[PDB]
Design an enzyme around this catalytic site. Structure first.
Site, PDB file in Angstrom:
ATOM      1  N   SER A 111       0.825  -1.197   0.000  1.00  0.00           N
ATOM      2  CA  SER A 111       0.000   0.000   0.000  1.00  0.00           C
ATOM      3  C   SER A 111       0.864   1.254   0.000  1.00  0.00           C
ATOM      4  CB  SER A 111      -0.936   0.006   1.211  1.00  0.00           C
ATOM      5  OG  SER A 111      -1.918   1.021   1.092  1.00  0.00           O
ATOM      6  N   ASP A 315      -8.657  -2.978  -6.131  1.00  0.00           N
ATOM      7  CA  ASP A 315      -8.403  -4.070  -5.183  1.00  0.00           C
ATOM      8  C   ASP A 315      -9.206  -3.854  -3.901  1.00  0.00           C
ATOM      9  OD1 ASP A 315      -7.124  -2.065  -3.773  1.00  0.00           O
ATOM     10  OD2 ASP A 315      -5.428  -3.336  -3.199  1.00  0.00           O
ATOM     11  N   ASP A 355      -7.226  -9.086  -3.259  1.00  0.00           N
ATOM     12  CA  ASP A 355      -7.600  -7.773  -2.762  1.00  0.00           C
ATOM     13  C   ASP A 355      -6.465  -7.122  -1.983  1.00  0.00           C
ATOM     14  OD1 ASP A 355      -7.454  -9.061  -0.371  1.00  0.00           O
ATOM     15  OD2 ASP A 355      -9.530  -8.697   0.240  1.00  0.00           O
ATOM     16  N   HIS A 356      -6.742  -5.925  -1.485  1.00  0.00           N
ATOM     17  CA  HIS A 356      -5.813  -5.159  -0.729  1.00  0.00           C
ATOM     18  C   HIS A 356      -5.341  -5.801   0.540  1.00  0.00           C
ATOM     19  CE1 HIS A 356      -3.839  -1.393  -0.516  1.00  0.00           C
ATOM     20  NE2 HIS A 356      -4.223  -1.232   0.721  1.00  0.00           N
TER      21      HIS A 356
END
Ligand SMILES: [Ca+2]
Ligand SMILES: [Zn+2]
EC number: 3.1.1.3
Length: 392
Positions: A111, A315, A355-356
């Site tokens: 991130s 995401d 996903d994130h």
């Protein structure tokens, strides 16, 4: 096989915590284990950095440097005057005192971690002209981090990073929505938000701003206080750096070092709707992301800001188009991976169907072999040659 012995360092985004925080629950691994541990067991020296999750990339970068070499966090006199926070932060022992003696490291960031990592590199290598000018103009001491000339970082790997920002902030209710992400990592870890724990649990490390959770304060209550604090209202925050415009600004001075390898990984947990052209959350995306953000990211357009249809895929928290490397306001080159890991260029490794939070194990996903993903990554980082010869 292996070409270097550099240790690996882990770095988090707007969410993150130390190995001893969240009662054992690791940001790097989550419900899937311990990433830093797996890599060490497989013979790759690996460490973990914990920096201010809501702090600007600059602050984080000063904290990362000090946490790596040891010492007291020095955010810079000009920087501290410009934003009205303390110049000096926390004191660290130094995870790797070998850096001040010629050693190198590999940075795996997730991130917002990726912007921090870029920034730290650019400061290590070039310092800060403003910080240098302010030191002699006002005779204050100067952190080595602002002189330039360091060569600690062999590579930088980015995973789900908002190199060009994320349009999630453009939400009208981004303030409240965003602190729900902290509540979420708290639940991921089995920690309630409506409870005044006496034990820290999750340290936001806001020493510079003089902020801390107090006695008989539940995370919920503390988050209400933060929202009204400079950490959420000033440009010197993660909230600014995360925005499209803020990233663009960061992108204007934070360039890829010619002496450092860069790897990009992109994430995607969505599907395109045939009639609207919008992206929709896929089955298995975490509930916080799928209910509020995922739908906003895949439908949000803004012509005047440059947000079109290539920014829809996401995401659940970050637009995929913004992960392959800085583009807006950047001179950094990006090259699709063709089997050769070039230096001084963003080696675009493509998009992965996670996903994130599934990429770091905070959210589960059994269709994703997280062990193999990070073992492949490190095997690739060890094979990196410090100095490559030019050839046919
Ligand atoms: Ca999932
Ligand atoms: Zn600051």
């Amino acid at each position: 096989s292996r070409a270097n012995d550099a240790p690996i360092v882990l770095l988090h985004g707007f969410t993150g915590w130390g190995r001893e925080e969240m009662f054992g629950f690791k940001y790097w691994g989550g419900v899937r284990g311990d990433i830093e541990q797996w890599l060490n067991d497989n013979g790759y020296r690996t460490y973990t950095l914990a920096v201010g999750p809501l702090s600007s990339n600059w602050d984080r970068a000063c904290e990362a440097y000090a946490q790596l070499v040891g010492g007291t966090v020095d955010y810079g006199a000009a920087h501290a005057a410009k934003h009205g926070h303390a110049r000096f932060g926390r004191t660290y022992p130094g995870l790797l005192p070998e850096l001040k003696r010629g050693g190198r490291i590999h940075i795996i960031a997730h991130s917002q971690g990726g912007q921090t990592a870029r920034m730290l590199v650019s400061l290590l290598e070039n310092g800060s002209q403003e910080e240098r000018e302010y030191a002699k103009a006002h005779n204050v001491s100067l952190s080595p981090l602002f002189e330039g000339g360091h060569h600690f970082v062999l590579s930088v790997t980015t995973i789900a990073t908002p190199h060009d920002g994320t349009t999630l902030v453009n939400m009208v209710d981004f303030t409240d929505r965003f602190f729900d992400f902290q509540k979420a990592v708290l639940k991921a870890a089995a920690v309630a938000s409506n409870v005044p724990y006496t034990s820290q649990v999750y340290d936001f490390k806001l020493d510079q701003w003089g902020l801390r959770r107090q006695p008989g304060e539940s995370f919920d209550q503390y988050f209400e206080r933060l929202k009204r604090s400079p950490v959420w209202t000033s440009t010197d925050t993660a909230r600014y750096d995360l925005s499209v415009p803020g990233a663009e600004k960061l992108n204007q001075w934070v360039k890829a070092s010619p002496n450092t390898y860069y790897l990009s990984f992109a994430t995607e947990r969505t599907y395109r709707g045939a009639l609207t052209g919008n992206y929709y959350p896929e089955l298995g995306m975490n509930a916080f992301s799928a209910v509020v953000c995922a739908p906003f990211l895949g439908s949000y357009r803004n012509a005047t800001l440059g947000i079109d249809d290539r920014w829809l895929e996401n995401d659940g928290i970050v637009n995929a188009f913004s992960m392959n490397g800085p583009k807006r306001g950047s001179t950094d080159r990006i090259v699709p991976y063709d089997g050769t890991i070039k230096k001084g260029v963003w080696n675009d490794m493509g998009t992965y169907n996670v996903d994130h939070f599934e990429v770091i194990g905070v959210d589960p996903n059994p269709l994703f072999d997280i062990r193999a993903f990070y073992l492949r990554l490190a095997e690739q980082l060890a094979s990196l040659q410090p100095h490559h010869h030019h050839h046919h």
